[PDB]
Amino acid sequence: QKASVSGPNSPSETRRERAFDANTMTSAEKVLCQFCDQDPAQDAVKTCVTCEVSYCDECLKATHPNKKPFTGHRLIEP
Numbered sequence: 001q002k003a004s005v006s007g008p009n010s011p012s013e014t015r016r017e018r019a020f021d022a023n024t025m026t027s028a029e030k031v032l033c034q035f036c037d038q039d040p041a042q043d044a045v046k047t048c049v050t051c052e053v054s055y056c057d058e059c060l061k062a063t064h065p066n067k068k069p070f071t072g073h074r075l076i077e078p
């Protein structure tokens with residue numbers, strides 16, 4: 001002899017964290033991919049000196065379609 005109801009409490013105790021500071025050295029940021037247009041864009045982990053512009057991976061994949069190891073364009077000198 002007892003009662004039992006379904007659908008217990010569920011208080012949304014979730015939180016977030018947003019920020020928008022200037023360009024500062026923290027760990028892994030670097031310049032933003034100019035070709036990107038995500039807004040925010042994707043970090044540019046590449047830089048083609050010949051193109052004179054810094055790009056990311058994805059972009060580099062479309063713009064610089066290389067099948068490795070590096071038979072495509074050029075990058076930051078050694």
Ligand SMILES: [Zn+2]
Nearest residue numbers: 033036056059
């Ligand atoms: Zn990009």
Ligand SMILES: [Zn+2]
Nearest residue numbers: 048050051073
């Ligand atoms: Zn290039």
